[PDB]
Design a binder for this molecule. Sequence first.
Ligand SMILES: Cc1cn([C@H]2C[C@H](OP(=O)(O)O)[C@@H](COP(=O)(O)O)O2)c(=O)[nH]c1=O
Ligand SMILES: [Ca+2]
Length: 129
Amino acid sequence: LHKEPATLIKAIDGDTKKLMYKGQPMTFRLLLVDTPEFNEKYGPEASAFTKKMVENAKKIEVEFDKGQRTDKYGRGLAYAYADGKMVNEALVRQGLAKVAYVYKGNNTHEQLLRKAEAQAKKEKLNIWS
Ligand SMILES: Cc1cn([C@H]2C[C@H](OP(=O)(O)O)[C@@H](COP(=O)(O)O)O2)c(=O)[nH]c1=O
Ligand SMILES: [Ca+2]
């Protein structure tokens, strides 16, 4: 897998954001995770966490997996990095997302993220509290 450039256009919520990618605006949905909706418990906190992570970053990159690069809604499906740190993993490690939506062929980082979930759950963090 390969990291590619993108720039932040706007934070949206815990697991979606609007990024400019190859010079075109796109909504990106984070692979392999599910944050609570803004309306739900921890929803606000997930949204804030992702917003802070991406807005503070000097360099945003997206990394596509081996499988489908856009979902049925036209959202990009990617792992997103903020100054080298994966947003997907960071949300899970903080208990602000669950590992979810693990589809065959877009699951390169599955085990990495499950390891982070186990640690967040062991620490009883946020969703796991
Ligand atoms: C994360 C992800 C979501 N999706 C689709 C599945 C769900 O379809 P449905 O809308 O029919 O429930 C939806 C969940 O995304 P959200 O969690 O952003 O709502 O996005 C994919 O198809 N591939 C993916 O990798
Ligand atoms: Ca969600």
